[PDB]
């Protein structure tokens, strides 16, 4: 569960990301595809080369979904309901993969937030991404 402090930390960190959210989304995906090749099995229809249009576009969608969750941090199950249905009933990405993307998002944020990525913020962001992942896999079965 996210504490008041967790929410303050997440909003502060994601706010700093600001306009770069889309760029970071694309970068996190790229880090994921390179570090954990098995995740590429879900994007056989994508050009996964560096800077591809599809990865850029998808990174934007992923980041915008996260921005929306932060804006509705006290009502994520509902704010992400549509996305949850999509992953549970159509995409069906195995649950194990969410931790991989979450880790890569954390690494991306760490690489871009020298000042705000403190141990406390690191902890809050990890809980947040795990919470988002949990919501996205809550309707799988």
């Amino acid at each position: 569960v996210l504490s008041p402090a967790d929410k303050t930390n997440v909003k502060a960190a994601w706010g700093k990301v600001g306009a770069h959210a889309g760029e970071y989304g694309a970068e996190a995906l790229e880090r994921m595809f390179l570090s954990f090749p098995t995740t590429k099995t879900y994007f056989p229809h994508f050009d996964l080369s560096h800077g591809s249009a599809q990865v850029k576009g998808h990174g934007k969608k992923v980041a915008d979904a996260l921005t929306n969750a932060v804006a509705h941090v006290d009502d994520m199950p509902n704010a992400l309901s549509a996305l949850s249905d999509l992953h549970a009933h159509k995409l069906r990405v195995d649950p194990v993969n969410f931790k991989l993307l979450s880790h890569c998002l954390l690494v991306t944020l760490a690489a871009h937030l020298p000042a705000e990525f403190t141990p406390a913020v690191h902890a809050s962001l990890d809980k947040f991404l795990a919470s988002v992942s949990t919501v996205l896999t809550s309707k799988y079965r």
Binding site: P37, T38, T39, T41, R92, D94, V96, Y140, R141
Partner: protein, 145 residues
């Protein structure tokens, strides 16, 4: 790594297995217990219910084929990577199957073996099979890139 005695336990129990039946049962339970795995078999027809899934002829046939390859691999426990190299590249380049699925089927298979053999599937025998299913899963994911 399957102590000489673990290899014997595996081979001894497997020699009593009806691979066709256990295969269809295993793939079926995979699809029932972890429904998202149904993502690769939309062309198999009716999978709307547990019984629909278990009785689905295409599910049974595929389970038989999958476990058949698994079975042949049990004769070469010392070179699982080599034995499944071709299927590994296949599931990665053509089928695009997340290897986690191999691990899930492995667990379901263990449950099916337990259900079928009862007390005969002792804790030591289980331990030996856990090493086998992990080895087969690792072998199948080895050529991914």
């Amino acid at each position: 790594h399957l102590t000489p005695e673990e290899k014997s336990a595996v081979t001894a129990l497997w020699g009593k297995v009806n691979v066709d039946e256990v295969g269809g049962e295993a793939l079926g339970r995979l699809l029932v217990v972890y429904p998202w795995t149904q993502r690769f078999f939309e062309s198999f027809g009716d999978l709307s219910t547990p019984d629909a899934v278990m009785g689905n002829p295409k599910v049974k046939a595929h389970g038989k084929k999958v476990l058949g390859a698994f079975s042949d691999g049990l004769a070469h426990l010392d070179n699982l990577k080599g034995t499944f190299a071709t299927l590994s590249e296949l599931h990665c380049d053509k089928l695009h199957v997340d290897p986690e699925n191999f691990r899930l089927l492995g667990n379901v298979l263990v449950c099916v073996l337990a259900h079928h053999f009862g007390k005969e599937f002792t804790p030591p025998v289980q331990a030996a099979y856990q090493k086998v299913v992990a080895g087969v899963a690792n072998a199948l994911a080895h050529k991914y890139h």
